[PDB]
């Protein structure tokens with residue numbers, strides 16, 4: 001059950017589709033970025049069409065919607081990465097084994113400007129920076145802390161009923177950490193410069 | 195899409211079901227175990243009915259069946275753990291970030307043994323305060339595999355000029371494999387828990 005906006009893959013399971021500037025889908029993604037990164041130049045935006053990553057993500061979304069007895073489990077967040085990680089992420093998504101002050105998971109920023117720091121979106125030899133727009137199953141979240149290998153329990157009376165994610169700040173979060181494969185789908189890659 | 199031989203779970207998402215000696219289901223597991231741990235005795239065998247683990251596992255298996263086109267990608271393997279880990283494995287499965295370094299490391303992931311005897315060592319199936327040892331019987335998506343190396347955080351590429359097209363698992367020896375290591379969530383389904391004693 002692959003999404004409408006996806007374009008035809010001629011019976012293939014993975015492609016990167018460059019968005020046409022000026023069109024509905026490109027503008028939507030551009031505006032999410034420019035909210036905090038308007039001083040940056042966008043070279044291009046690619047839609048990640050990864051059927052396998054999508055199916056595994058969607059199964060986890062349906063599980064979490066049942067578990068939490070609501071939708072509102074999903075947020076659109078940013079992830080800056082070096083150019084040499086881009087192919088792996090395109091194919092395999094986010095892997096916690098590859099500063100973890102709020103725990104040993106994969107980090108995602110509320111604001112593109114946070115992910116646009118050179119420490120995350122490392123400029124390549126040409127000054128090209130890379131940032132993903134990511135669907136993340138943040139679900140029910142709590143404040144994290146160093147050393148977590150999974151999120152904490154909602155009640156230590158029930159040690160295996162866990163929060164879905166952890167944050168820096170529960171009232172006003174600026175980052176989310178997830179600890180399980182297939183809790184994040186890389187949806188768009190932004191290639192840009194300072 | 196839950197298997198039809200499972201107990202009705204009454205909209206419950208998780209259940210441990212105690213098997214009866216004399217059932218084929220019990221005897222096949224007991225024989226797979228006593229093959230290499232005839233010196234131990236089984237207290238009980240529980241089938242693990244975890245709907246979410248099952249669904250995510252079967253999705254990964256369908257993907258590996260399509261990707262590798264005509265394979266036996268699945269093996270039935272053993273995993274000894276301590277009693278404190280059993281609640282978490284039962285609900286959430288096998289988490290590489292919780293994994294013990296193995297005495298012979300072929301990568302930083304979750305280890306599964308071909309032989310019950312390996313998993314029966316106190317170093318994995320640690321006796322609890324009552325002398326109970328715990329070992330899972332696990333469907334593991336071993337797929338296409340190679341000899342691993344202590345440094346691995348993911349399985350290696352099949353081809354060094356295409357670094358993202360990976361082996362599915364690694365092993366100690368490709369000709370006589372006696373353990374497997376997997377580096378991803380939902381690549382292992384814990385099907386049965388054997389509680390045993392000396």
Ligand SMILES: COc1cc(OCc2cccc(Br)c2)ccc1C(N)=O
Nearest residue numbers: 078079080099101107108109115120
């Ligand atoms: C590892 O990568 C990141 C880490 C991020 O927070 C790391 C952090 C930890 C503790 C305090 C603060 Br303040 C920030 C945010 C975004 C990315 C990213 N790739 O976009």
